[PDB]
């Protein structure tokens, strides 16, 4: 169904907030593009139940971006690449 999404987080701060809440199972790369932060979740191995869960969490802070993933990778720029959320927990959480 859906296992990689391009989510628009209202700003970077939404991504942070989200990172600070269970977002495990997400390799993730965080773009800022048009000053809005898209956060590209790349779920590696989740079932339908597991995504409906996880994707919820993300989408407490996000909406599901209408911007294509090849648009992020091309016409956007990385903010935290890696496991963006995970990395954000390191350098942004208090």
């Amino acid at each position: 169904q859906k296992l990689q999404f391009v989510l628009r987080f209202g700003d970077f701060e939404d991504v942070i907030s989200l990172s600070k809440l269970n977002v495990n199972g997400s390799k993730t790369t965080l773009y800022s593009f048009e000053n809005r932060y898209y956060l590209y979740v790349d779920f590696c191995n989740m079932t339908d139940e597991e995504v409906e869960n996880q994707l919820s969490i993300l989408l407490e802070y996000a909406t599901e971006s209408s911007i294509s993933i090849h648009r992020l990778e091309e016409y956007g720029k990385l903010i935290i690449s890696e496991h963006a959320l995970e990395t954000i927990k390191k350098h942004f959480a208090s």
Binding site: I57, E60, H91
Partner: protein, 798 residues
């Protein structure tokens, strides 16, 4: 927003409760949904209970979508998904006209935001999202009352009431009744004139502009029981609604066809009341560009009483019906509707408060509503007594509401900063420079909470305005266009008039007191707020006081008519303005003077140089000065009830243009003074017939053109120059010293005070431009023009 219902607010807090109870420390939509059902059996909750959702069922699902535990009670607030559901609900109550937002709307809004966690909660627990939004709506919407049921009647009514239109009688038996507050004494007079069978048509004449429609609901009540005669019982009131006629019509033929249909059904004759608002359009009578002529069907109908109807007309309208006597005069018969008494105004004002409390200022302040009234008769002064009024109210009933959200305390700097953060942060992560955005992010959201905290400390500016329209404010708004800052404008009119008219203290005080008497809201408008003669020759300060009267009297410079009497003699504007021997007064009465004052009834009307016109014009004008009205221009009535009539005159010129100087002594100056302060007050009577002038409220005298007047002329010209340059964005001021160097080239005895403009051009315009071009001074910088030791010098300041 502010102004919500309980049920809503309750549903909202319950989300937060579940935040921690389920471990989702951010309240997404899953908790908002839960909130709805956790409010138990309120309209949101109940709705969800229909589709198959218990409070229980939701919180477990909710808990299954963000997991449990992840709690620590880490600032459990909403997140943007949850915020979207709220934005939608407000509109889902607006939709229903609610200036409040209840439970229903919150589920309605939830559904709207039918993606996110709420959405998944309901779609996992076997509930279609729209099936839920349905359910809330169809239980309760907006909160209101005033309803009744049971009862039906009548058969003959069928063809008519379909078309066209709502029946006035019905809504007051539906418990949707509205008084509406008039103009009560008008309602009684209708039924003599109505329950005839020979001239059974009432025709109400007032102004638009009185809220004529208020009187109409009166009729409804009396038509039911029982004032109208015994076999003239069983009356029904049907309004011939213009809106229904235009609907489904797109041609003149079609419009006529709709009127024909109404007329055909009108067989309910002599026991049917037809209400025709703005009667004139159908008759089509008068003018040089008449309206559509329904008159062919309407005239025999009116005479017959098959069209037994009520006409709602205004100040001007009546002439064009009595002209077609008698079948709209064998029908018509008049009854007096107010030129609104001040008191009638007040009650309307008060009545419309709560909906300017949707603009959230007015309701209240009381004195300020009163200000709308009291201020309107004299200050704006541009319509009729209640139209004027309400505008003053709502303008101010928004003005301050605009001033409201301008800042936090002064913590506007916070917001400015919070922006700057994003930038730094963003661009740094764009390089990444992860943590080089991070601390900037952290600083941002810190900031944000401060911003929002002190901007909703500027809820104090809500509690300020959201019931208050301010005294000073209503007045201020009245001053702005054209209570406190109109009655301070009134009381201190003289103070305001003195700052713009230099010399002619005689004149200023005379206008001031006459206008201020009228202007205290204590004189009925049915005569100018000041009638005046402004004496002295051209160039003595006359006009300038008229202008200064607009500022002081009206609260802004705006609104000044100005008509030349010299044209109404055909010998000063017979070849400078189009016409022929049988023209000129026909243009003025018939068009110019009357039309001009209809645009702004407020206006200081200046009928210049009245000596030049023969006294016959003055008789026509005399009606303006007395009555406050003229009827001209195809039967239109012009309210000079609100004007200030100012007639200027050809008076005393020789001394009253004579300058001071030394003619024999250093007391030839003080002999230009005392002499000018004598010369107006005896020269005035010679410049006109007495018949005009007596209907003038104080006889204003303006004296000479001293030496002394020269340096006042430099200060009139230089200030007009520098001000037309302000649009560029040049901030200029002239010191008196700079006006002096300009005078150096204009103290000519052989060319008068004319060279001063040219010398201003040379020393101000030319000089400022020669300083701006070099970049010595700039636009937006405040520019002081001075003379140092004899030579002009241009300095710059902020």
């Amino acid at each position: 927003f502010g102004r919500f219902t309980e049920r809503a607010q309750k549903v909202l807090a319950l989300a937060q409760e579940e935040a921690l109870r389920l471990g989702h420390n951010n309240i997404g939509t899953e908790h908002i949904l839960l909130g709805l059902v956790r409010e138990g059996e309120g309209i949101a909750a109940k709705a969800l209970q229909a589709l198959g959702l218990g409070s229980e069922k939701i919180q477990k699902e909710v808990e299954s979508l963000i997991g449990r535990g992840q709690e620590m009670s880490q600032t459990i607030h909403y997140t943007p998904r949850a915020k979207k559901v709220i934005e939608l609900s407000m509109d889902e109550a607006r939709k229903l006209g609610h200036s409040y937002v209840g439970t229903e709307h919150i589920l309605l809004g939830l559904i709207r935001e039918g993606e996110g966690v709420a959405a998944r909660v309901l779609n996992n627990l076997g509930v279609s999202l729209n099936k839920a939004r349905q359910q809330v709506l169809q239980l309760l919407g907006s909160n209101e009352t005033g309803s009744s049921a049971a009862g039906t009647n009548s058969n003959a009514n069928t063809p008519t009431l379909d078309s066209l239109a709502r029946d006035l009688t019905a809504i007051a038996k539906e418990d949707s009744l509205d008084p509406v507050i008039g103009r009560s004494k008008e309602i009684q007079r209708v039924i003599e004139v109505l329950s005839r069978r020979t001239k059974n048509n009432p025709v109400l004449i007032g102004e638009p502009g009185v809220g004529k429609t208020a009187i109409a609901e009166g009729l409804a009540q009396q038509i039911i029981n029982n004032e109208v005669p015994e076999i003239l019982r069983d009356k029904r009131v049907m309004t011939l609604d213009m809106g229904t006629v235009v609907a489904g019509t797109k041609y003149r033929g079609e419009f006529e066809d709709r009127l024909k249909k109404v007329m055909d059904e009108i067989r309910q004759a002599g026991n049917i009341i037809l209400f025709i608002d703005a009667l004139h359009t159908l008759i089509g009578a008068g003018g040089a560009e008449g309206a559509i002529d329904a008159s062919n069907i309407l005239k025999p109908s009116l005479a017959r009483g098959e069209l037994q109807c009520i006409g709602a007309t205004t100040l001007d309208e009546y002439r064009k019906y009595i002209e077609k006597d008698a079948a709209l005069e064998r029908r018509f018969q008049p009854i007096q509707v107010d030129q609104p008494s001040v008191d009638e105004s007040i009650q309307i004002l008060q009545g419309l408060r709560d909906r300017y409390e949707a603009h959230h200022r007015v309701s209240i302040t009381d004195d300020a509503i009163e200000a709308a009234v009291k201020l309107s008769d004299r200050y704006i002064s541009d319509r009729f007594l209640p139209d004027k009024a309400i505008d003053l109210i709502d303008e101010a009933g928004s003005k301050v509401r605009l001033r409201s959200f301008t800042t936090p305390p002064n913590l506007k700097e916070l917001e400015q900063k919070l922006d700057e953060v994003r930038k730094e942060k963003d661009a740094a992560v764009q390089s990444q420079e992860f943590e080089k955005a991070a601390s900037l992010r952290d600083t941002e959201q810190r900031l944000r909470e401060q911003v929002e905290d002190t901007k909703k400390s500027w809820k104090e500016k809500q509690g300020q305005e959201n019931s208050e329209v301010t005294v000073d404010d209503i007045a201020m708004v009245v001053s702005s266009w054209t209570a406190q800052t109109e009655t301070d404008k009134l009381l201190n009119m003289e103070n305001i008039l003195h700052s713009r008219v230099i010399g002619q203290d005689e004149a200023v005080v005379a206008v001031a007191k006459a206008v201020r008497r009228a202007r205290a809201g204590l004189k009925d408008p049915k005569r100018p707020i000041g009638s005046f003669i402004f004496l002295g020759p051209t160039g003595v300060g006359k006009t300038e006081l008229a202008r200064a009267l607009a500022e002081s009297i009206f609260g802004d410079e705006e609104s000044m008519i100005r008509i030349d009497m010299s044209e109404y003699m055909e010998k000063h504007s017979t070849s400078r303005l189009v016409g022929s021997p049988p023209g000129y007064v026909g243009y003025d009465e018939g068009g110019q003077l009357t039309e001009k004052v209809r645009r702004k009834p407020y206006s200081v009307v200046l009928l210049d140089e009245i000596e030049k016109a023969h006294p016959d014009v003055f008789n026509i004008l005399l009606q303006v000065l007395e009555d406050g009205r003229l009827t001209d221009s195809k039967g239109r009535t012009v309210d000079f009830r609100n004007t200030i009539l100012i007639m200027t005159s050809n008076v005393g010129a020789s001394e009253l243009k004579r300058n001071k100087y030394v003619g024999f002594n250093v007391q030839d100056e003080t002999q230009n003074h005392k002499d000018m302060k004598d010369k107006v007050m005896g020269e005035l009577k010679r410049a006109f017939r007495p018949e005009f002038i007596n209907r003038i409220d104080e006889i204003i005298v303006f004296h000479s053109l001293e030496k002394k007047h020269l340096t006042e002329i430099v200060s009139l010209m230089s200030d007009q120059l520098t001000k037309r340059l302000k649009e560029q964005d040049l901030s200029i001021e002239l010191t008196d010293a700079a006006k002096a160097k300009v005078a150096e080239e204009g103290v000519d005895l052989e060319y008068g005070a004319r060279p001063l403009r040219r010398a201003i051009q040379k020393h101000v315009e030319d000089r400022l431009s020669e300083e701006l071009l070099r970049g010595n001074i700039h636009k937006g910088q405040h520019i002081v023009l001075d003379v140092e030791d004899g030579e002009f010098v241009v300095k710059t300041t902020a």
